[PDB]
Amino acid sequence: AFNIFFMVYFFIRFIAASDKLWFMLEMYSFVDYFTIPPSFVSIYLDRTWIGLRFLRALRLMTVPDILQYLNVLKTSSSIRLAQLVSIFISVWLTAAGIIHLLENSGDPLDFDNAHRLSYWTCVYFLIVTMSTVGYGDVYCETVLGRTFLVFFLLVGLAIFASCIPEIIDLIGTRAKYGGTLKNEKGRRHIVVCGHITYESVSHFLKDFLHEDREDVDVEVVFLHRKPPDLELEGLFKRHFTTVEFFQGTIMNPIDLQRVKVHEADACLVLANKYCQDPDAEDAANIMRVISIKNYSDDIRVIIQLMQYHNKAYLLNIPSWDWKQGDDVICLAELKLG
Amino acid sequence: LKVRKYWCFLLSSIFTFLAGLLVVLLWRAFAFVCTFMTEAKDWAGELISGQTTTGRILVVLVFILSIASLIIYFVDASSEEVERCQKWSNNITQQIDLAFNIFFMVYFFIRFIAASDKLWFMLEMYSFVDYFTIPPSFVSIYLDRTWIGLRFLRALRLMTVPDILQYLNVLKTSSSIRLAQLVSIFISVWLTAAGIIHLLENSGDPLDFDNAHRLSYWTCVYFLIVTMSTVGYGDVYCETVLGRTFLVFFLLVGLAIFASCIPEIID
Ligand SMILES: CC(C)CCC[C@@H](C)[C@H]1CC[C@H]2[C@@H]3CC=C4C[C@@H](O)CC[C@]4(C)[C@H]3CC[C@]12C
Ligand SMILES: CC(C)CCC[C@@H](C)[C@H]1CC[C@H]2[C@@H]3CC=C4C[C@@H](O)CC[C@]4(C)[C@H]3CC[C@]12C
Ligand SMILES: [K+]
Ligand SMILES: [K+]
Ligand SMILES: [K+]
Ligand SMILES: [K+]
């Protein structure tokens, strides 16, 4: 019942083929040549043979094509991952079928040195070979089995060494920093963005959380684009109950929702004082204030500014209001003062 | 050993995980249809991170019994048999195991309170270790018989050593933190995988248990390092169906760990 469907599917593919000569030599059609015709012969002969039924595993390499036809796979990484997994599994299962047939049948024209091996033992034997472990508990004994193993060792080992490392890093690790900040009743928090480094965060947290000042239950939420390094991650661990970090940009309205800017007491924009171009640094920080004010107008913003002539741009923003608590800390004005 | 009660140990661990999973979901529904918790949640989170003086003691105390729990598992796996019945009062090893396990459940409860969301906490990797470790101890207490079970999961607790050292500010530079993470990950995976091989090979195939392969735990440790190095002497190899099945999955991922951790540890 399955084979008759595949021949009419083969005929449909034949009609759709642009050139018939190259279609007959296609890899997929070669699978159908050695699969369906044996079924009819076994029907007339009233006897069954395992034959080359292992070639059905080669049909798994068209799964990424099938998923792309239905638009299930969209991003490039998912397409690459699907191709590598499908190729590795199909080759692994097909090679195990070849070993299973050659070993169990025995040498041709005598068929007296048959080696009894289960198919799943051959699957286990194949993965030991591709990993280059080679226990030797299971090994090929027939001439044909060893002959195929010689060719497989040349090409099969390269597939394992190229697919598995690329599969692992493509999967990667789950995003450690992400998701929305959990809402709490009667909770006060501030959002700190801009120049977020280990030196800037540690210096800020020491001054912000000092037992010489009044005790207030305000927690700090950090938003930055680049993931933190190991030193910064350890610092956040030591302040687990009062400091939270999220990965994202203040210019993305989605990320502003994640950190709950509209519910924050104030937004603090740190600046890179040791920057090559003070004008470029000031322009980036000014755009951050515009993004925050665009999301909501009644949010207190405190921003570190590098040069005084850039202060006019912030003052000309319609939503900027010094009465409501918006402040500009100009390093050039304060230092020279 | 006429009838094996290993299913009772597995059923209780599955039931405990399922009961806790639905209770959290039911409590969310119960809360939906219907100040101390907030105060306790902040206090609990401060304790597990070792911010206060009592928090530092608990974090250090967690380190001490994490190694101790694994050590008593080594002497427990040295037994020739995997299943045996004995009075709990006769052996002092079971008594010490109970003393360590009761601490880990109250430590689990403290971590549960400190958790921001309870649903994701129940699915955490660390909590999965506690699901299959402590509930079997109580079942073995009532059944008056002991089983090796999944006690090898205690080695997974070693991956929190870098977190413990970071809580106490022992690790400061980035290189030391990276080195601690790689060493802890490699050792925990190596010891856990050896425990899986030791259990599967010694127990035998399920529902028959007649093809058991007698292997010591340290032989499995030696077998694992030969596998990850891709040397494969073949003097020691898996014979059971379940043992080979796990080896197939380990060869896909375990070999990558060795090839990525050891070169990075050396330099
Ligand atoms: C594309 C064509 C020309 C390639 C050559 C045809 C191939 C596929 C055919 C022709 C001869 C056939 C082989 C003849 C003899 C044997 C030995 C038997 O115990 C297993 C099958 C096996 C190994 C056959 C496999 C398929 C085979 C190799
Ligand atoms: C997270 C949950 C859903 C995963 C599935 C539950 C797992 C952990 C449980 C359910 C069935 C259990 C298995 C049932 C049978 C056996 C065979 C026995 O000789 C060794 C233990 C072993 C191998 C058990 C290991 C643990 C097990 C696999
Ligand atoms: K090798
Ligand atoms: K070898
Ligand atoms: K080898
Ligand atoms: K060998």
Curated annotation (Swiss-Prot), chain B:
The S4 segment, which is characterized by a series of positively charged amino acids at every third position, is part of the voltage-sensor. The lineage of its organism: Eukaryota, Metazoa, Ecdysozoa, Arthropoda, Hexapoda. Residues 115-118, 165-179 are cytoplasmic. It comes from the Eukaryota. Expressed in muscle cells, neurons of the CNS and PNS, mushroom bodies, a limited number of cells in embryonic and larval midgut and in epithelial-derived tracheal cells. During pupariation and embryogenesis, it is expressed in muscles many hours prior to the appearance of functional channels. Residues 79-93, 140-143, 201-213, 237-245 are extracellular. The chain crosses the membrane at residues 6-26, 57-78, 94-114, 119-139, 144-164, 180-200, 246-266. It comes from Drosophila melanogaster (Fruit fly). The gene is slo. Homotetramer; which constitutes the calcium-activated potassium channel. Interacts with Slip1. Interacts with Slob, and, indirectly with 14-3-3-zeta via its interaction with Slob. Interacts with Pka-C1 and Src kinases, which can bind simultaneously to it. It is found in: Membrane. Residues 214-236 dip into the membrane without crossing it. Phosphorylated. Phosphorylation may be mediated by both PKA and SRC kinases, which activate the channel activity. Phosphorylation by PKA is however unclear. Indeed, although modulation of channel activity requires Pka-C1, it does not interact with the whole PKA holoenzyme. Potassium channel activated by both membrane depolarization or increase in cytosolic Ca(2+) that mediates export of K(+). Its activation dampens the excitatory events that elevate the cytosolic Ca(2+) concentration and/or depolarize the cell membrane. It therefore contributes to repolarization of the membrane potential. Kinetics are determined by alternative splicing, phosphorylation status and its combination interaction with Slob and 14-3-3-zeta. While the interaction with Slob1 alone increases its activity, its interaction with both Slob1 and 14-3-3-zeta decreases its activity. This is Calcium-activated potassium channel slowpoke.
